[PDB]
Symmetry: D2
Subunit: 116 residues, 4 copies
């Protein structure tokens, strides 16, 4: 699988478990088409979103449902979600890890891109 998402909780010093993630791909008409979705495991990782065949060139949006995460923990956070928007596979297939580090009023996101 060429797309993985990893989420950490900066309050607890732990993986962020059970975080919902929705991936979209920009369609020819400029709308965001649902592409794939899942939730993070006990390790804070989400594997198996897509395949080499399916993950073609395009502009992708990874929406990490941070508010739903903090609210399921009984906490009122600032952001609705974290949105990570990027062009993928434009120089041929790559493997993408999208990492996010969450706090109630702040987040960071990093991409690790490797060539198989």
């Amino acid at each position: 699988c060429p797309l993985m998402v990893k989420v950490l909780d900066a309050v607890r010093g732990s993986p962020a478990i059970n975080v919902a993630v929705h991936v979209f791909r920009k369609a020819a008409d400029d709308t965001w088409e649902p592409f794939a979705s899942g939730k993070t495991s006990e390790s804070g990782e989400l594997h198996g979103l897509t395949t080499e065949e399916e993950f073609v060139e395009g502009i992708y949006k990874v929406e990490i449902d941070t508010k739903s995460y903090w609210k399921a923990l009984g906490i009122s956070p600032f952001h609705e979600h974290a949105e990570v928007v990027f062009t993928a596979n434009d120089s041929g297939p790559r493997r993408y890890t999208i990492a996010a580090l969450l706090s109630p009023y702040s987040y960071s996101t990093t991409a690790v891109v490797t060539n198989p």
Copy 2:
């Protein structure tokens, strides 16, 4: 003005100058309606986007044009833009600063909400 945006460059250790910033408000039909826009100053700041009267409760999106920033510096970046989506909440008097710290393959964003 209840909304300020501040952008920093983690590669050069500087304000991120002349970055385009677009603010949108979510409409009743779930589309994003243009609300305010500008370019960051020499201090990396964008002041004067809105007023207390106009900045009512609702869901807002701040889009920071990071890709153009990096390309103007001759650097290849990962993201198309950085997006910050939040609800404005009246809960007594409030000022919102949306801060962003930019690297080519990473960004951080923080909200500083004060009275």
Copy 3:
């Protein structure tokens, strides 16, 4: 003043107020000599630590007492303190802002160096 320190709280979305900050300068024998100190203001800022005359080239350490900050808020943190170690370099006129963004198990620090 060529050195300012700014501290933000990522849990509350606020300046980090009343945080103790200690600055040290590396001596010829490789020990850390006290240089300047203070507590962050209501804006999370600490101004007036030094002067252009005193802030000569050399290696400096800024220690931010994060542990006491979190404990005063009734929160259990990971780090003893946050440490920022850098060389001051004359290279024309320079102002250094050391910014820190605090969470219980994580922190970020950035240097904004301007003329």
Copy 4:
């Protein structure tokens, strides 16, 4: 091994390879005693620093040699090193991952602490 260090490069979107790391432990006389050292692999990870037996309670400092990393890449960075200082194992043995995300003028560090 109960102590692991992971380093990413935010400029390249890659693991930070060949980063030197020195760990110290505060001694009874309040000095920093050398405890362990190593360098990050091709994955950006440093394994095998210590053992359960050796990694007793204490105050530890993990020094990540960021300037040496950026200078080996021909880049002039701001910081000398990143220093991560923490009390370990005070409620019994834990596993610690110290992560760092590097840019020339900025870094972040996060701890992930798990109970085996």
